[PDB]
Amino acid sequence: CPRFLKVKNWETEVVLTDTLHLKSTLETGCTEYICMGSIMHPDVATKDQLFPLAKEFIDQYYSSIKRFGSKAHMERLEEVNKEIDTTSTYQLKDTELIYGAKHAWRNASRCVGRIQWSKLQVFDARDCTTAHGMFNYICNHVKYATNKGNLRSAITIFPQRTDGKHDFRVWNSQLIRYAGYKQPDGSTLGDPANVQFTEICIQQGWKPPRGRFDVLPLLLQANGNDPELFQIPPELVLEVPIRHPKFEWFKDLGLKWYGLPAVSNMLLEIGGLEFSACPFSGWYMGTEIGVRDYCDNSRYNILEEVAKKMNLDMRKTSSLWKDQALVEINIAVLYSFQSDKVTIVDHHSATESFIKHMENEYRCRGGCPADWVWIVPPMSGSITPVFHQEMLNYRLTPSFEYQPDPWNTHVWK
Amino acid sequence: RFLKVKNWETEVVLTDTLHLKSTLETGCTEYICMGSIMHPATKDQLFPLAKEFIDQYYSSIKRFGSKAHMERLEEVNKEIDTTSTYQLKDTELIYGAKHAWRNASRCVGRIQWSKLQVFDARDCTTAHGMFNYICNHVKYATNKGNLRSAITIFPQRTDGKHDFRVWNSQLIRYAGYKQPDGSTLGDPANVQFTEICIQQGWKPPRGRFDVLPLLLQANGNDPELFQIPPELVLEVPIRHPKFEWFKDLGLKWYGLPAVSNMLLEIGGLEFSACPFSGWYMGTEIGVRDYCDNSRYNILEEVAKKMNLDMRKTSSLWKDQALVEINIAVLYSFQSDKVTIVDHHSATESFIKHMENEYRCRGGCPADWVWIVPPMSGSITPVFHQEMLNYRLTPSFEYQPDPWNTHVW
Ligand code: HEM
Ligand code: HEM
Ligand SMILES: Cc1cc(CCNCc2ccc3ccc(N)nc3c2)ccc1C#N
Ligand SMILES: Cc1cc(CCNCc2ccc3ccc(N)nc3c2)ccc1C#N
Ligand SMILES: C[C@H](O)[C@H](O)[C@H]1CNc2nc(N)[nH]c(=O)c2N1
Numbered sequence: 001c002p003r004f005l006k007v008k009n010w011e012t013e014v015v016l017t018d019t020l021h022l023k024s025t026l027e028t029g030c031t032e033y034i035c036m037g038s039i040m041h042p043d044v045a046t047k048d049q050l051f052p053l054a055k056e057f058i059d060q061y062y063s064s065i066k067r068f069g070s071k072a073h074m075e076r077l078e079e080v081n082k083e084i085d086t087t088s089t090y091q092l093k094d095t096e097l098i099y100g101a102k103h104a105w106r107n108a109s110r111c112v113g114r115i116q117w118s119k120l121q122v123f124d125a126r127d128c129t130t131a132h133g134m135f136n137y138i139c140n141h142v143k144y145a146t147n148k149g150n151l152r153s154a155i156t157i158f159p160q161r162t163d164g165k166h167d168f169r170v171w172n173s174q175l176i177r178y179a180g181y182k183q184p185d186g187s188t189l190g191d192p193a194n195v196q197f198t199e200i201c202i203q204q205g206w207k208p209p210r211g212r213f214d215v216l217p218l219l220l221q222a223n224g225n226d227p228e229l230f231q232i233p234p235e236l237v238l239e240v241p242i243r244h245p246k247f248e249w250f251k252d253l254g255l256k257w258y259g260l261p262a263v264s265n266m267l268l269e270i271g272g273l274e275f276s277a278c279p280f281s282g283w284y285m286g287t288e289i290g291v292r293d294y295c296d297n298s299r300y301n302i303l304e305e306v307a308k309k310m311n312l313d314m315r316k317t318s319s320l321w322k323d324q325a326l327v328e329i330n331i332a333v334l335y336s337f338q339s340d341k342v343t344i345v346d347h348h349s350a351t352e353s354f355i356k357h358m359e360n361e362y363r364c365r366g367g368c369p370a371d372w373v374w375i376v377p378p379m380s381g382s383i384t385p386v387f388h389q390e391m392l393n394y395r396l397t398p399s400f401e402y403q404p405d406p407w408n409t410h411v412w413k
Numbered sequence: 414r415f416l417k418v419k420n421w422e423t424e425v426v427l428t429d430t431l432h433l434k435s436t437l438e439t440g441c442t443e444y445i446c447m448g449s450i451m452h453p454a455t456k457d458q459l460f461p462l463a464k465e466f467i468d469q470y471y472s473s474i475k476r477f478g479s480k481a482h483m484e485r486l487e488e489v490n491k492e493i494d495t496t497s498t499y500q501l502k503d504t505e506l507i508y509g510a511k512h513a514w515r516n517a518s519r520c521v522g523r524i525q526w527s528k529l530q531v532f533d534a535r536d537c538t539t540a541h542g543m544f545n546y547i548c549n550h551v552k553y554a555t556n557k558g559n560l561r562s563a564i565t566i567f568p569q570r571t572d573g574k575h576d577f578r579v580w581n582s583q584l585i586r587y588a589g590y591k592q593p594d595g596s597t598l599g600d601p602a603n604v605q606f607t608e609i610c611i612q613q614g615w616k617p618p619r620g621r622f623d624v625l626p627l628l629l630q631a632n633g634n635d636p637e638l639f640q641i642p643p644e645l646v647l648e649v650p651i652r653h654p655k656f657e658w659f660k661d662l663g664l665k666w667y668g669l670p671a672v673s674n675m676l677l678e679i680g681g682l683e684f685s686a687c688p689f690s691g692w693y694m695g696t697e698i699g700v701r702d703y704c705d706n707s708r709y710n711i712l713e714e715v716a717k718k719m720n721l722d723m724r725k726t727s728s729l730w731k732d733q734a735l736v737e738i739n740i741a742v743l744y745s746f747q748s749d750k751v752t753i754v755d756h757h758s759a760t761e762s763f764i765k766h767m768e769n770e771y772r773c774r775g776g777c778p779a780d781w782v783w784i785v786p787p788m789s790g791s792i793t794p795v796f797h798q799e800m801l802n803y804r805l806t807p808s809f810e811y812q813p814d815p816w817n818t819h820v821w
């Protein structure tokens with residue numbers, strides 16, 4: 001590979017030079033003859049697989065703290081090496097855990113919020129043994145991160161994978177999400193994205209209120225055991241009713257959303273160690289709710305209803321009634337969060353901050369991997385600066401990864 | 414291997430085999446994706462390329478290994494041997510041109526690919542000739558508002574010193590002027606080209622929407638200036654169906670998007686001059702041309718007139734203004750009976766096209782970064798459509814601006 005790759009911004013003419021891509025560790029899925037950049041997704045580590053992965057990470061940590069080649073560095077290498085030899089795995093120090101979590105975020109190509117990467121509260125839950133204990137750790141996380149509306153980015157990290165039959169898993173895709181219910185007539189109540197998970201919860205014993213915005217229970221698996229249900233205390237679940245600054249009728253739509261986006265189904269990989277339960281949270285970009293959650297056809301799908309209340313001509317697509325309604329909905333989401341003082345960022349601010357982050361990263365780190373397809377917001381793409389910015393995408397480690405759904409793999413006891 | 418693409422909204426899963434055919438590089442590697450980067454002969458090289466193309470042409474007309482097929486390969490071989498090149502048949506030319514369009518991974522309008530009027534201009538020898546061919550193209554394609562896709566193909570490259578080139582980036586574009594106070598009048602995208610026209614003798618009206626002259630290079634000679642006859646230039650005054658004040662902005666655009674700086678490659682042959690044209694998707698003008706910061710940049714002016722609060726970005730004043738502008742553009746073109754497609758309609762057609770191509774051809778190369786419209790992305794079906802990008806030939810390629818290579 002070429003040592004220097006250039007990216008250009010076609011709006012500002014600014015040219016950046018990437019050297020960091022040489023540290024790329026895994027495959028993107030693309031080849032020389034085909035690009036898979038719009039594909040959504042294109043038994044444990046053996047001792048010999050584990051050695052060089054650990055060393056790579058340890059070197060990286062010690063390089064970051066300006067102690068590369070030091071006695072403490074060489075000693076840590078030796079201690080790790082001996083641990084893998086005698087136990088087939090190793091345990092990270094707290095400092096290394098914190099560094100690795102922050103870097104998984106820093107390395108997340110698809111995240112437009114990474115300017116904040118170094119400000120991440122890390123909770124070490126590696127001493128947790130039961131699903132009840134996971135619940136306790138999770139409640140504390142939610143309360144800390146919510147902070148009465150002044151959100152704080154955080155991650156809680158449960159014990160790493162051992163033999164793969166003792167995995168810790170949060171079965172929820174996010175800590176807070178709304179139930180979806182399929183009706184006998186084929187219609188869907190609540191959030192259609194969550195129907196499958198909802199059915200599992202009901203089967204596991206959950207009594208469903210069967211409403212439109214029912215906060216799902218936690219379904220928590222510890223040490224490879226069967227998962228257990230827990231209700232999050234409602235006072236810990238911060239929600240915002242959606243209203244519009246001009247349209248008095250908007251509140252009559254009865255919409256609301258939760259303040260804390262807290263993804264709980266990813267896998268954190270550090271130094272070849274695998275943390276299958278590592279729920280993390282930041283705060284929302286408005287479009288996540290206003291465009292995707294509300295206006296996707298396979299989600300809440302509210303465009304028609306809003307357009308009708310806006311008295312728009314909905315007969316021809318060329319009237320842009322959809323686009324017109326889309327903007328008002330996103331105005332409403334941002335207005336409601338700001339009014340209740342719950343942290344949220346609009347897509348203009350977020351993308352402008354990302355450009356500055358990207359430029360800084362190129363300066364100090366020699367690059368910043370970015371997935372344009374994900375970075376560009378789902379509305380008004382070209383009026384944000386990221387649209388015009390060439391990006392290079394590649395995978396650095398530590399990283400957040402997708403993993404299979406736990407109900408697909410779990411061995412029921 | 415067979416590759417699958419999934420639509421995440423419909424859950425439809427298509428299977429791509431067509432990608433196995435590509436031999437050209439994309440720029441990405443196993444470790445680095447360049448999907449958002451805008452830009453990632455000899456007898457010996459020439460014959461296999463010719464052979465590949467003849468083969469797929471005769472394969473496409475259901476006569477692979479026919480008597481005609483064998484003879485053509487032999488004929489082409491002799492011609493490359495004895496002349497260092499070869500000439501396409503008319504049929505091959507037309508097939509080649511339609512397929513370059515079909516294979517254009519960045520084009521959302523490809524449902525139309527087989528409907529393309531091909532104007533053969535390979536007998537052209539002078540800039541005056543080029544002008545004549547171009548006028549006929551514009552007149553035919555414009556068709557009084559009922560636009561018709563067309564391509565005019567000028568003689569292929571020989572030694573590189575005698576290229577035919579249309580120096581304009583589009584046949585019809587507006588001039589851009591650098592003002593004493595450092596601002597720009599008209600279209601900033603064309604400031605450089607405009608300056609070259611001025612220096613070559615063009616007397617500029619110095620307005621906001623001055624139709625540029627044609628600057629035409631034939632056979633490697635110095636380019637020459639021509640004024641397109643105004644009656645051939647269809648333009649649309651932009652008004653809004655609800656905001657009576659919108660027409661007071663004095664905005665307009667031309668009806669015919671006619672890209673003129675690309676290179677058409679067929680069977681190893683290079684057509685450095687091949688202006689082609691279709692019709693507009695509204696966002697091209699309403700989002701990019703009008704609202705890009707580096708273009709006409711009208712958002713602030715429009716938002717003023719809408720009396721929006723422009724203090725905080727979270728008011729989404731830009732997004733509001735953007736929608737209204739695009740409403741105006743569509744309404745204006747439609748009211749004037751000038752062909753235009755909205756991004757909802759176009760992306761919808763593109764999905765149907767993809768379905769067609771997977772069914773009959775085994776896939777469809779597509780560049781999601783370009784296919785998804787620059788506004789309202791995820792409320793169009795292409796946002797939710799996984800796409801595989803790969804390079805098939807015949808193709809349209811970029812080439813350098815002629816003023817960076819030409820000696821006078
Ligand atoms: C602090 C404010 C943050 C903002 C505004 C933000 C913004 C975003 C947005 C808008 C996306 C696209 C999500 C989607 O469309 O589904 C995203 C993706 C992502 N974010 Fe961030 N984020 C923040 C914090 C975090 C944190 C704290 C982490 C981890 C420590 C993180 C890691 C990721 C990852 C791994 C993805 C890719 C998600 C996927 O592939 O499904 N982000 N972020
Ligand atoms: C008939 C109606 C057509 C529509 C609605 C349409 C639509 C579009 C749009 C919106 C783009 C993106 C352009 C940009 O953002 O700059 C594009 C790209 C492209 N189109 Fe089409 N198009 C049409 C006809 C054609 C024709 C007739 C040809 C050639 C024979 C063609 C070949 C291409 C190529 C090569 C690109 C890529 C341009 C580049 O790489 O800069 N299209 N099309
Ligand atoms: C349909 C689908 C969607 C997704 C995106 C989920 N990722 C959301 C996410 C992740 C991290 C975030 C961090 C901050 C924030 N505001 N939003 C964040 C949102 C993944 C997989 C599939 C599948 N299959
Ligand atoms: C600034 C820049 C822009 C571009 C995109 C031009 N693509 C226009 C185009 C091409 C073909 C079209 C076909 C139909 C249509 N409606 N519009 C069509 C518009 C490429 C290179 C550079 C550079 N440097
Ligand atoms: C098909 C396409 O890859 C898919 O719809 C992607 C596009 N870009 C995205 N970008 C973000 N931020 N989030 C998404 O879910 C998606 N979906």
Ligand SMILES: C[C@H](O)[C@H](O)[C@H]1CNc2nc(N)[nH]c(=O)c2N1
Pocket residue numbers: 010387388389390391448449450451782783784785
């Ligand atoms: C940097 C990025 O590749 C560039 O801005 C692209 C993005 N997608 C695009 N898509 C279309 N249709 N037209 C464009 O000019 C661009 N520009």
Ligand SMILES: [Zn+2]
Pocket residue numbers: 030034035036037441442445446447448
């Ligand atoms: Zn790629």
